[PDB]
């Protein structure tokens, strides 16, 4: 099994009213859900509004991140996977002089859709610098590209993190 962590997703923005019954029933239409809970009040009871699910699989989360936006009991709802900022960038080194747009985009656009490729360059030769920045058009793109342990592009190891 995949280590929990992983198959976790964090519920921002709940409705009050959204209940652990409620909750489960919604993000059960993507997958098997081995733990749903609506984070509370100790003492009031009253919700926090937030609370978190936890998949069977990491295939699962991924289809529920894209079933948004996810409207829970009457609103719109905040999934984010855990941590394991929330930014929509990326930094890519080890690309070295042979990387070209099309390796990075081939590649990319399997965790998400790209807005910008910025392939650096150095400011007095124009040489390539080896390293990359990638823009998606949303976060789950990054936190799932960061997670992994591995990044192969055109054949290099790549160092793969959140920018800015
Ligand atoms: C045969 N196996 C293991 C797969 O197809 C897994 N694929 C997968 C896809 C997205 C997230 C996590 C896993």
């Given at each position: 099994?995949?280590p929990?962590?992983?198959?976790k997703?964090?519920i921002?923005?709940?409705?009050?009213?959204?209940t652990?019954?409620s909750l489960?029933?919604?993000?059960?239409?993507?997958?098997?859900?081995?733990d749903?809970?609506?984070?509370r009040?100790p003492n009031?009871?009253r919700?926090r509004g937030f609370?978190?699910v936890?998949?069977?699989?990491?295939?699962?989360?991924?289809?529920?991140m894209?079933?948004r936006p996810?409207?829970?009991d009457?609103?719109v709802?905040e999934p984010?996977?855990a941590?394991?900022?929330?930014?929509?960038?990326?930094?890519?080194?080890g690309?070295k002089?042979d990387?070209?747009?099309?390796?990075?985009?081939?590649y990319?656009?399997?965790?998400?859709?790209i807005?910008?490729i910025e392939?650096?360059?150095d400011?007095?030769?124009?040489?390539?610098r080896?390293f990359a920045?990638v823009?998606?058009?949303?976060?789950?793109?990054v936190?799932?590209?960061?997670?992994?342990?591995?990044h192969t592009?055109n054949g290099?190891?790549?160092?793969?993190?959140?920018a800015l």
């Amino acid at each position: 099994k995949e280590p929990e962590q992983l198959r976790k997703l964090f519920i921002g923005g709940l409705s009050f009213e959204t209940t652990d019954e409620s909750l489960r029933s919604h993000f059960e239409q993507w997958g098997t859900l081995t733990d749903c809970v609506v984070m509370r009040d100790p003492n009031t009871k009253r919700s926090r509004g937030f609370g978190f699910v936890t998949y069977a699989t990491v295939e699962e989360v991924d289809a529920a991140m894209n079933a948004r936006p996810h409207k829970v009991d009457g609103r719109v709802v905040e999934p984010k996977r855990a941590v394991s900022l929330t930014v929509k960038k990326i930094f890519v080194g080890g690309i070295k002089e042979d990387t070209e747009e099309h390796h990075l985009r081939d590649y990319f656009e399997q965790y998400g859709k790209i807005e910008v490729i910025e392939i650096m360059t150095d400011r007095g030769s124009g040489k390539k610098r080896g390293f990359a920045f990638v823009t998606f058009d949303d976060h789950d793109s990054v936190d799932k590209i960061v997670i992994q342990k591995y990044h192969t592009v055109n054949g290099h190891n790549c160092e793969v993190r959140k920018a800015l």
